[PDB]
Design a binder for this molecule. Structure first.
Ligand SMILES: [Mg+2]
Ligand SMILES: [Mg+2]
Lengths: 233, 195, 240, 231, 244, 222, 212, 204, 235
């Protein structure tokens, strides 16, 4: 039995024609206090997988150490550790999913929602979700927390089903993600302006972008809004 | 499980136990014998939580019978009662205690005396001339305080017992379907078939 | 815990510790079991080098396992108590769960199983004891007599003997005991049991113990005078 | 002599006699051959019988859809080690959704056998194993010895008179390695290899045992009338 | 491994004997003689101390005779340290019984349990047996006055009169000669001392080389009393019988 | 306080024919009022001509299926590649479920296949392992909507022969694979209309002696 | 649920319903609430489906092991006690079982034992267990006699379940009949309440409360 | 469901001139129901006296426990235990069950056989020793006993006078408590004689 | 001394090889498998005439479809039989079906090598496990203390095994009837047995698909013995 203390908010992601995109803001909330502002919640594993984590940050750091140790362990007695026997997104996800479900079954969960984004060795896009209950699912768009309620609707307008994935480019997909992050900044009280974004492409590989900001924001209309009903001045 | 009574007279101990076994709004049985013979001259009646009562009674029975075989000797009622008390005393501080109250009626062959012991589920032991468990005592004790004499015969003890059952049948809310009466004396244990 | 495998195979395929346990049985005082038409009798030797004994309190050779089953033995006396205790506990456990007393075969099978377990368990030696188990099954009038030994094998016997000079008394029983017509009465069965012990014992004074078991938990041990009457009767008929 | 009472004792020359005696049990065992190409890996085993009335002792055991082995020596020890491999292959699939690499399989067997040679009370395994498999890096063949030593090979053989088959494969190396995309021809080379270890007896229908794994071929065992093709 | 150094204490000889038990009995045969005699109205326990030194504190010493409870006592023959381990266990067992049944433990039950412990060390555990033989003297309301003996094998037997330790062969012959069933305590006291006086390896039997105890019903009306004799009391009883 | 259970919604449906059996299920996965996936399969081919679905709390469902699939694999190893019969699979699943009697898998399990006489079979389970063979069973969120429709159309309940004064019942008969699929599709479209957790897609697994065939159909996405 | 079993001149009658409920939802109408342990032993099921089904099939395995080890069919007393001792170990854990172990042996004769999840074990001639037990008792007790024929006994057991199926909301579906004799148990069919009710109403003239 | 007041009962101990007294009621009940009027709460191990109030099963259990321990003490020490030593033993035994305690209020009383000094002591349920020159009280009428003892008690009372003081303290305390009374026993303890007296009191 | 799980220089486990010598001292047990059934027969070998031979239980039921005969230190077989019976019943509970004869035999053989320094020594008894299942039909297995089991068309174990096995080599063919197999066990038993074969000192049994495992009565076997003698005298 736990309760989350220092928390991270939405992680959002989607598939596009050649790969996957994932994003998450750089905030570590302490209840209503916006305590920590330099928290990286996207953690790359190798050059082909990015794990995005929300929820309890202490448990996130524990999961970082597990992934870091998994890469070390996989390299032991493995001449093909950087080739055919390298870690796949599917291997990394299943490991975490096993751990998440085992911990909930011992009534001592890792208080997180996790999205594993990556590209498999055969070029197939990998995008799957797992959380504190051990619940897992896959979809062309995946999101956690407020992202599930606000980002998914926007991302699903681009990729509404499987057949829309080949029709979606990296430029269009990234634009939708960045737009979704702006919407979350408007409407999520536990979000920040600063965020990180990661693109895993089957051709150009892993591109990790840090220190991105939400921009082109609409606030001007606020000046005209006066009172809460009858007030004119 | 509700009514168990005990009366120690001059030359015997008489135990009376109700025949009803009730579960919910149904009397499942009206001929239940709520007692086990621990040894030829020692009888134990019991009442309490369903399942626990019989499980406990039979466990005690097996242990006393084991002792009898090992030593080729019958334990005294006092010795049996102390053993039973200790088991209940252990039980009350266990993970799941035996919720079972007992009366032990026995005839000590060495002393040539009847003996009645009342033990509750906490391991509270007392030797008495007459005893009861549950709500039964609230009616019978005052009745026995009045009518009981220490030098009574077995027949007089049975008439006294009839008077208790009549009072219970009159004022008790629940129908306990009469009682099975058993006598413990020098000649052993026998049942009164017509009561 | 002490783990050592004490009972092990030898090149010739023998378990010496089990066979040496049989030698301890061969050293023990003689015990005989004879079953009749409506009874079983257990005879036991008591060595007469021990005078100034207190026969009231000295452990009896025949032990009640339940009210309907008895157990005598030959071999190490201390070892026998462990089997008897385990047997008595199992007898009460059987009554508790099955709501019926043990059959003689079942009780024998349990005791034999305990003996066997001590022949392939680490850190223990075999029981230096062979038992004769006799009695009557619940609600049954057919006499039962079984034998066990250190290895753990057990079997039923019309009549059998164990202990020192048992080969002599077995020789006697093999010609004197008729399968087609066993001892019809209690007297005949006891007499044959006493006769068989008189081939080995020495004197028929306080050396022979006799225990008679009958159906429906009817067990009684004979006194000195009662046994002495059989001894007196046999010797007078012998002089012929 | 004085240093062969248990596995925890070194000889004055630095030998482990109980391990060497366990190795001797393999030499007494019936012959089995292993060989591979770039696309497929093949096991061929000569099964042994007690007499004409008895069945023939099964030599090949399946570990997963993509891996299995053949045994030579104490069969129950092969059952224990193969059972351990089944669990490790299965652990890899359930936890990591990953087919166990044949090289890791060998490393795991080595470490399991090693622990039994350094501790008091236990004993070394009395069996030799030939593990074949097809994983992400192609076809593989391993040789396991109960000393702990595991070796990756193009081809090999273990058991009684195994030197004959081993010499043949050493000559045929350049030929059978390039049998790619042709199961029957690779098996034929294996059946011809095991034939070099035969004396007096010949390969019959209920005597021969063959197994194969490859690119688009799950680990499957052939016995009985199914191996009549290769005689 | 450690197998090399294992003596194997719980095994049979080819003849069917327990090596360690037999060798423990050989040890006990060199110990100071202890005698027990049961009379109709009490029990006597007499024991010879092992080669006493003149500077040994005799009055505040306990080597042979120990009290298990108010009704039961034992005479020791063998390793004193081993005996004390078993004695404390027996004392605890007696109290467990009293706690359970609110009755003093019957003598045989205490003897059986202590003998069962000894038996265990001969059958399992891989440890040496206790090099101790006891004579148990006690009373209960079932069998009255009782004498028992146990030895390292865990076998126990009942007796009218018995000796353990050194010179038991000679001692048992003398007891068998002079003992009779209608004997009194005062007569048994005399027999015990006379037997020790003839079997002893010492030059002459004296008070400082003895321990003595009686269990009588000499207390007031239907109750048992244990009397562990003091040095001066042994001196007096030795003169009274005409040994010194 | 931490709640180890959740509701992932969705509904499943198993029907047995004469020489075939179907196990159908929608592909929508949900939590509360949100859609997690429009296509997340929960009807699986487990080998040996057995199809299985464990609907309810998806984590427990995936765990159970995963464990049963593994049970089939080990049954082959331990018993000389013997085929696991549907009745033997059913009993095996009871022990898997009852093994967690005091911390249950929060799922309604249904398996389908052919019995040892080649006839269509469906077995249904409660969360703690009580099971029963049936011709017809709906499970999950919309079970209460679908099941009485099946009683009426598959087992012909409350339908009497016209003109017989309600004396002669409508006779039972086996339905064709074509007629069964019609009832499945109509059941799921009806459930999609009247249940918010049901929709997106319908995946049907059909089991015959030839093997396991799949069929997919679109459902309303609102 | 409604289950009963009673003892009479010609042996033992056993009768049960077939309804399963999860709250007010009727989960099934075709459930087997009698377990066939062996040719001479039956077990009835009330309370939790899984607990009853799992542990009574387990009981059959234990009864089978008994006759392998002892070369003799287990007694009804011994069989019932294995189950009662099992559930007693789990007491407090939340098992919910109301069972009746019915059978014939030579030494015992026809015997019925009531066993439940709070450890109670009772031998008796007549028992009714379940949510509809009172309704079954009402019909069964008022018409019961020891001198009943096998035909009349079977009908009374059937009629008693029907009575409960009618009044008790959590009982219904169909009636499963069993007869146990010296030779073993005999199955007397599945009887749908849908047809049985109207048949009994017409032929007997009972159930006048219902709109005919 | 308060363990200390289910069965009811009281114990009181006082010191006098070269003497001590300990007394108790005879009631054992089950809440309102009086069950036994013969249930004595005072026990002795050699010359050391122990009274115990509270849950009757624990009263009995602890008596059996201290009989057990003082018997072994005597065998090993070859002498009877003294009141000071026994007080420490009671404390140790109670605190050993710190988080699962016996629900009792024990009272030790006795005269040291060596020094001749009168000794009394009391304990809480987990063994905290309350040593006192004057008096110790325990049970369901402890408030009443404190009031009676504080007013009636004076130092250096003779055995015959002490008897009257302790008897009147107990009786009048018991008559103001529903769960106490139903008879009473008083022990008067001198250096080498002990007198036990049963008191006449109201039986309601 | 020396370790329990020690290898010899030839590559064999000392204790396993020594246990095989104990089995050679055991009484003879013969098994014959046919398409109509599997027959199991044993030499009782009573050590004395006073021993009631009907109490000698060397043929044993494991399940309705599996039987078992033993030879060697027969006391060691009791825990093996107990394990087999449990394994058979347990499998039926888990899978609602009969258990394969081979799987049952494999389960028994897993105990064999579970000894060392687990039990203290190997079993000193060999088992003939006979049975029937739907997949592989009528089967006969020989389970040794080495953990190894061979399937046999016919097999003899015990003191007269090498002589009986040579006799089974010649006599066995694939078209044997059940009656022919019964007589063949009795014939070969009578040859290798010390004492003269009769209904009291020898026991027969069989397992068929229809009637399951059955131990024959002394009356039934006596007729087969009388039938056997007449047929040998007939030519
Ligand atoms: Mg919808
Ligand atoms: Mg009042």
């Amino acid at each position: 039995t736990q309760q989350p203390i220092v928390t991270g908010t939405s992680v959002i992601s989607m598939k596009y024609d050649n790969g996957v995109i994932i994003a998450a803001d750089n905030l570590g909330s302490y209840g209503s206090l916006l305590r920590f502002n330099g928290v990286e919640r996207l953690i790359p594993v190798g050059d082909n997988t990015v794990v995005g984590i929300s929820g309890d940050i202490s448990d996130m750091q524990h999961i970082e150490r597990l992934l870091k140790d998994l890469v070390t362990e996989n390299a032991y007695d493995n001449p093909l550790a950087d080739a055919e026997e390298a870690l796949e997104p599917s291997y990394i996800f299943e490991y975490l999913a096993t751990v998440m479900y085992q911990r909930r079954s011992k009534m001592n969960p890792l208080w997180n929602a996790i999205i594993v984004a990556g590209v498999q060795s055969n070029g197939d896009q990998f995008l799957r979700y797992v959380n504190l209950l051990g619940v897992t699912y896959s979809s062309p768009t995946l999101a956690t927390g407020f992202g599930a309620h606000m980002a998914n609707p926007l991302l699903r307008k681009v990729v509404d089903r499987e057949s829309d994935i080949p029709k979606t480019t990296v430029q269009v997909a990234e634009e939708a993600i960045v737009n979704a992050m702006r919407v979350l900044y408007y409407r999520d009280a536990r979000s920040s302006r600063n965020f990180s974004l990661a693109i895993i492409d089957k051709n150009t590989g892993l591109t990790f972008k840090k220190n991105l900001q939400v921009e082109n924001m609409k606030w001007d209309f606020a000046k005209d809004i006066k009172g809460y009903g009858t007030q004119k001045i | 499980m509700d009514i168990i009574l005990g009366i120690r007279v001059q030359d015997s101990v008489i135990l009376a136990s109700s025949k009803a076994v009730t579960r919910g709004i149904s009397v499942l049985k009206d001929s239940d014998d709520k007692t086990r013979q621990l040894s030829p001259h020692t009888l134990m009646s019991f009442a309490g939580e369903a399942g626990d009562t019989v499980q406990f009674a039979e466990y005690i029975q097996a242990n006393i019978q084991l002792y009898s075989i090992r030593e080729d000797y019958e334990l005294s009622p006092q010795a049996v009662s102390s053993f039973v008390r200790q088991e209940l005393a252990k039980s009350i501080r266990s993970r799941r205690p035996y919720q079972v109250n007992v009366l032990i009626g026995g005839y000590d062959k060495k002393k040539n005396k009847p003996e009645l012991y009342q033990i509750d589920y906490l391991g509270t032991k007392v030797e008495l001339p007459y005893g009861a468990h549950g709500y039964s005592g609230f009616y019978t004790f005052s009745l026995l305080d009045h009518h009981y004499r220490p030098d009574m015969t077995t027949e007089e003890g049975l008439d006294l017992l009839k008077l208790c059952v009549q009072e219970l049948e009159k004022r008790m809310p629940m129908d306990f379907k009469g009682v099975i009466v058993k006598i413990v004396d020098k000649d052993g244990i026998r049942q009164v078939d017509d009561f | 815990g002490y783990d050592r495998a004490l009972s092990i195979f030898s090149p010739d395929g023998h378990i010496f510790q089990v066979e040496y346990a049989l030698e301890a049985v061969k050293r023990g005082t003689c015990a005989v079991g004879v079953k009749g038409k409506n009874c079983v009798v257990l005879g036991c030797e008591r060595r007469s080098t021990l005078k100034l004994q207190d026969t009231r309190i000295t452990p009896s050779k025949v032990s009640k396992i339940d009210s309907h089953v008895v157990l005598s033995f030959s071999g190490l006396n201390a070892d026998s108590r462990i089997l008897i205790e385990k047997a008595r506990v199992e007898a009460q456990s059987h009554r508790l769960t099955l709501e019926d007393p043990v059959t003689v075969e079942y009780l024998t099978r349990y005791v034999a199983g305990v003996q066997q377990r001590y022949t392939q368990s680490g850190g223990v030696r075999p029981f230096g004891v062979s038992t004769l188990i006799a009695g009557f099954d619940p609600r049954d009038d057919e006499p039962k007599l079984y034998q066990t030994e250190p290895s753990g094998i057990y079997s039923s016997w019309s009549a059998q003997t164990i202990g020192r000079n048992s080969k002599t008394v077995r020789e006697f029983l093999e010609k004197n005991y008729d399968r087609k017509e066993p001892p019809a009465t209690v007297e005949e069965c006891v007499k044959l049991t006493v006769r068989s012990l008189l081939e080995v014992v020495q004197t028929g004074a306080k050396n022979i113990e006799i225990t008679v078991v009958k159906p429906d938990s009817d067990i009684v041990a004979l006194s000195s005078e009662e046994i002495n009457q059989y001894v007196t009767q046999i010797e007078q008929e012998k002089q012929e | 002599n004085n240093y062969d009472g248990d596995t925890v004792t070194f000889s004055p020359t630095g030998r482990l006699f109980q391990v060497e005696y366990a190795l001797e049990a393999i030499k007494q065992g019936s012959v089995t051959v292993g060989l591979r190409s770039n696309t497929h890996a093949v096991l061929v085993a000569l099964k042994r019988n007690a007499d004409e009335l008895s069945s023939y002792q099964k030599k090949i055991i399946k570990c997963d859809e993509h891996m299995g082995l053949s045994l030579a020596g104490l069969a129950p020890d092969a059952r224990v080690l193969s059972n351990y491999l089944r669990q490790q292959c299965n652990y890899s699939s359930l936890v990591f959704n990953r087919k166990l690499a044949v090289e890791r399989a060998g490393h795991l067997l080595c470490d399991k056998a090693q622990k039994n040679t350094q501790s008091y009370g236990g004993r070394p395994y009395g069996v030799g194993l030939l593990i074949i498999g097809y994983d992400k890096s192609g076809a593989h063949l391993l040789e396991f010895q109960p000393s702990g030593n595991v070796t990756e090979l193009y081809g090999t053989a273990i058991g009684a008179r195994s030197q004959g088959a081993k010499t043949y494969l050493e000559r045929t190396l350049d030929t059978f390695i390039k049998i790619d995309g042709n199961p029957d021809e690779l098996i034929k080379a294996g059946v011809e290899a095991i034939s070099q270890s035969l004396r007096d007896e010949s390969l019959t229908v209920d005597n021969l045992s063959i197994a194969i794994v490859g690119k688009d071929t799950p680990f499957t065992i052939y016995d009985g009338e199914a191996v009549a093709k290769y005689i | 491994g450690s197998r090399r150094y294992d003596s194997r204490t719980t095994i049979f000889s080819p003849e069917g004997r327990l090596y360690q038990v037999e060798y423990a009995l050989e040890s006990i045969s060199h110990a100071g003689t202890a005698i027990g005699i049961m009379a109709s109205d009490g029990i006597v326990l007499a024991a010879e101390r092992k080669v006493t030194s003149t500077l040994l504190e005799q009055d505040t010493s306990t080597e042979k005779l120990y009290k298990l409870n108010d009704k039961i006592a034992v005479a020791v023959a063998g390793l004193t340290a081993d005996a004390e381990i078993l004695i404390n266990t027996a004392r605890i067992h007696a109290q467990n019984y009293l706690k359970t049944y609110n009755e003093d433990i019957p003598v045989e039950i205490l003897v059986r349990r202590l003998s069962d412990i000894k038996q265990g060390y001969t059958q399992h555990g891989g440890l040496r047996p206790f090099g101790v033989s006891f004579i148990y003297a006690g009373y209960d309301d079932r069998y009255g006055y009782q004498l028992y003996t146990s030895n390292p094998s865990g076998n126990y037997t009942g007796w009218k009169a018995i000796s353990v330790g050194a010179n038991t062969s000679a001692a048992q012959t003398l007891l068998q000669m002079d003992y009779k069933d209608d004997m009194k305590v005062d007569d048994a006291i005399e027999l015990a001392l006379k037997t020790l006086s003839k079997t002893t390896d010492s030059s002459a039997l004296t008070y400082d080389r003895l321990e003595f105890a009686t269990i009588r019903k000499g207390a007031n009306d239907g109750e048992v009393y244990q009397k562990i004799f003091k040095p001066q009391e042994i001196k007096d009883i030795l003169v009274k019988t005409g040994i010194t | 306080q931490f709640n180890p259970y959740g509701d992932n919604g969705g509904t499943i449906l198993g029907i047995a024919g004469e020489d075939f059996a179907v196990l159908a299920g929608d592909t929508r996965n949900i939590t509360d009022y949100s859609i997690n996936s429009r296509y997340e399969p929960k009807v699986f081919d487990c080998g040996d001509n057995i199809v299985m679905s464990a609907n309810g709390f998806a984590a427990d469902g995936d765990a159970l299926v995963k464990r049963f699939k593994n049970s089939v694999k080990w049954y082959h190893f331990d018993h000389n590649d013997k085929k696991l019969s549907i009745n033997s699979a059913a009993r095996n699943i009871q022990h898997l479920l009852y093994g967690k009697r005091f911390f249950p898998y929060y799922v309604h399990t249904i398996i389908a296949g052919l019995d040892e006489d080649g006839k269509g079979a469906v077995y249904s389970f409660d969360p703690v392992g009580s099971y029963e063979r049936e011709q017809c069973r709906a499970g999950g969120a919309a079970a209460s909507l679908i099941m009485p429709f099946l009683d009426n159309q598959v087992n012909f309940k409350n339908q009497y022969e016209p003109g017989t004064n309600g004396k002669v019942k409508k006779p039972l008969k086996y339905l064709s694979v074509e007629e069964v699929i019609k009832l499945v599709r109509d059941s799921f479209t009806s459930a999609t209309e009247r249940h918010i957790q049901v929709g997106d897609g319908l995946e049907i697994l059909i089991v015959t002696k030839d093997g396991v065939r799949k069929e997919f159909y679109e459902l309303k996405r609102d | 649920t409604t289950t009963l079993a009673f003892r009479f001149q010609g042996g033992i009658i056993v009768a049960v319903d077939s309804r399963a409920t999860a709250g007010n939802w009727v989960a099934s109408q075709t459930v087997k609430k009698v377990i066939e342990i062996n040719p001479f032993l039956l077990g009835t099921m009330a309370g939790c489906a899984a607990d009853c089904q799992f542990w009574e099939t387990w009981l059959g395995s234990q009864c089978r092991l008994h006759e392998l080890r002892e070369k003799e069919r287990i007694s009804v007393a011994a069989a019932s006690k294995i189950l009662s001792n099992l559930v007693y170990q789990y007491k407090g854990a939340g098992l919910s079982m109301g069972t009746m172990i019915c059978g014939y042996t030579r030494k015992e004769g026809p015997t019925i034992y009531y066993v439940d999840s709070d450890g109670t074990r009772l031998k008796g001639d007549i028992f009714c267990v379940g949510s509809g037990q009172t309704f079954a008792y009402g019909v069964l007790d008022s018409n019961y006699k020891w001198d009943l024929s096998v035909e009349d006994a079977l009908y009374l057991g059937k009629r008693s379940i029907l009575a409960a199926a009618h009044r008790d909301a959590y009982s219904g579906g169909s009636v499963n009949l069993y007869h146990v004799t010296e030779d073993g148990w005999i199955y007397h069919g599945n009887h749908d309440v849908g047809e049985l009710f109207w048949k009994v109403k017409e032929e007997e003239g009972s159930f006048n409360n219902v709109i005919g | 469901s308060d363990p200390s007041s289910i069965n009811g009962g009281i114990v009181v101990a006082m010191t006098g001139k070269d003497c001590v007294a300990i007394a108790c009621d005879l009631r054992l009940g089950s809440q309102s129901l009086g069950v036994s009027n013969k249930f004595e709460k005072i026990f002795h191990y050699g010359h050391v006296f122990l009274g115990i109030t509270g849950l009757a099963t624990d009263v009995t259990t602890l008596n059996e426990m201290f009989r057990y321990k003082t018997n072994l003490y005597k065998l090993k020490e070859e002498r009877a235990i003294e009141p000071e030593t026994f007080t420490q033993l009671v404390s140790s035994s109670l605190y050993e069950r710190r988080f699962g305690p016996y629900f009792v209020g024990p009272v030790v009383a006795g005269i040291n056989s060596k020094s001749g000094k009168p000794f009394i002591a009391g304990f809480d349920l987990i063994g905290c020793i309350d040593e006192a020159k004057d008096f110790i009280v325990s049970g369901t009428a402890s408030d009443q006993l404190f009031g009676m003892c504080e007013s009636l008690y004076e130092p250096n009372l003779e055995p015959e006078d002490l008897f009257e003081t302790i008897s009147q303290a107990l009786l009048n305390a018991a008559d103001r408590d529903a769960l106490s009374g139903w008879g009473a026993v008083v022990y008067i303890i001198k250096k080498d004689e002990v007198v036990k007296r049963y008191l006449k009191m109201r039986q309601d | 001394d020396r370790g329990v799980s020690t290898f010899s220089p030839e590559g064999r486990l000392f204790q396993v090889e020594y246990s095989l010598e104990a089995i050679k001292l055991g009484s003879t047990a013969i098994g014959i498998a046919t398409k109509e059934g599997v027959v199991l027969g044993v030499e009782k070998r009573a050590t004395s005439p006073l021993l009631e031979s009907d109490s000698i239980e060397k043929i044993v039921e494991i399940d309705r479809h599996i039987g078992c005969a033993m030879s060697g230190l027969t006391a060691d077989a009791r825990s093996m039989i107990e394990h087999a019976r449990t394994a058979a019943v347990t499998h039926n509970l888990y899978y609602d079906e009969d258990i394969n004869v081979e799987s049952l035999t494999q389960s028994v053989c897993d105990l064999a090598l579970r000894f060392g320094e687990l039990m203290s020594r190997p079993f000193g008894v060999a088992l003939l496990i006979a049975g029937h299942d739907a997949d592989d039909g009528y089967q006969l297995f020989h389970a040794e203390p080495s953990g190894t089991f061979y399937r046999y068309n016919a097999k003899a174990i015990g003191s007269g095994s090498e002589g009986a096995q040579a006799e089974l080599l010649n006599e066995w063919h694939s078209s044997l009837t059940l009656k022919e197999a019964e007589l063949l066990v009795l014939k070969i038993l009578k040859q290798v047995m010390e004492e003269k074969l009769d209904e009291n000192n020898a026991q027969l049994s069989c397992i068929t698909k229809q009637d399951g495992f059955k131990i024959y009565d002394n009356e039934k076997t006596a007729e087969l013995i009388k039938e056997l003698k007449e047929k040998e005298a007939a030519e």
